[PDB]
Structure formats: structure tokens, C-alpha cells
Amino acid sequence: GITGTWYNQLGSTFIVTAGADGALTGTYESAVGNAESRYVLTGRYDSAPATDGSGTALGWTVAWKNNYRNAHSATTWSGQYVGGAEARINTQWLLTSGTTEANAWKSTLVGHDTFTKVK
Amino acid sequence: GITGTWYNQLGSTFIVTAGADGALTGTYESAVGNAESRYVLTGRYDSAPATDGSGTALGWTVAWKNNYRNAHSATTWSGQYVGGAEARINTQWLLTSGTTEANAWKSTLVGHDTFTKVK
């Protein structure tokens, strides 16, 4: 139920494939999806979740660098997939920027994204 | 054991008084302690912690505005006090800045501070 295209509330598109081994691979891009806005993503998920109605734990990372741009930062999303008619992936994320030692204290932003199968 | 002066690794000084009711009141200042860098702090703590060797849960807030400066932001520290010869307050914090709707996604920084009774 994870493989496919997902959309968040900020206008980003998450295209992912869930391997049978627990691997997550794909791309993260803007609403449009032009070449310069596409970034590689890799992650892992629980390929054998509980059957008590619990969600499926997962996480992935995107380093904000491609063959055109580099924001010297990386974001990791940690959350869980909830299946159903209105399936979604609820996450909390950490965005860390490369900084000097003096600015290390303010190197990480925290937030949350909800992804859905419909825009 | 909480009342007193505390120091973090960044060079900040935390002066606090722990009330019998569970209130925390004090000031957060720079190493130098000049008036322009002194801010009011208020918080709460567990006034009746467990006796199984567990730490004492606590938290406080500092809005970064005083009678001299205003950084339009506020930080909350959440953690626990651990007593002993080398007492410490281990925390994780959230720094939120006032932002426009468009910048709300990057309004909050996350980090961690360890406070000790010795510099």
C-alpha cells in the first residue's frame, strides 16, 4: 500500500517504491517536477507490520543535492503509514544544514508532514 | 536541589528558584550577565518525584524579549533534573520564531542542552 505517488500539504510530490526486503527508494520533487527540482530519496520500512490495527513504521532521507543545485542540507522523515480508504503517511521531520561550529546550535529545524494519495 | 545557578555548554547562565508548589521562576542570561541579555523564565517541575532513582521531570519557557531587546521568538526546554555529586539537568529544546504563513514550515529549531552547577 506504500508504493506509489504521495502528496503533502506544502506542494511536494513523493514517488516511492517499497521493496519486499524493507527498502524504500524513489524521488522527492516539487508540484511541477522539473529536473532541477527532483531529488533522490532512500529509506526503510517495517515489511511485516503487526496485525492489531497498528500503523507501519517507516522513515526516509533526502539530501538536498542533485546534478543542478545543492542546499547543503538533508531532511529525514520518521513516521507511519496508515492504510484504508483515506490512507496516509503521518510524519515528523528533521532538517539539518551543514554549519560552522559556531552555528551548530541552530543547525536543525523540526516539523511535521502528512502525505495523502490525493492532492 | 534545583534552586540555584546553572550553566550550559553554550555559555549561558540559568538562575532559578524551585517553589514548593512546583513552580520555577528565574532569569536566563549571558555569561557576563549584563542587563540587556537578561530574560525572564517561568516553568514547572514535578515536586514529588518517584523514589526509584528516576530523574525529576521539568520544563520552562523564555520569550526572547526584555526591556531592551526583542528577538520575536521563544524557547521551551523540556527535560529532567538528576541529583548527585555531579548534578545535571538534561534537556531538549524548541525555539520558535514568529513567522509569516509562508515561512511557518521553518519556524522551529530543535536542540539539546546539558546544564551543570559548575562552569
Partner: peptide, 13 residues
Amino acid sequence: RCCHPQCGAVEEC
């Protein structure tokens, strides 16, 4: 407004 890939930036700033 958005100048970072995370907030869905399309064009460079």
C-alpha cells in the same frame, strides 16, 4: 517565497 526544496520550491531564488 519558498527558496528551499523542502517547501516545494520550483524556481531558484
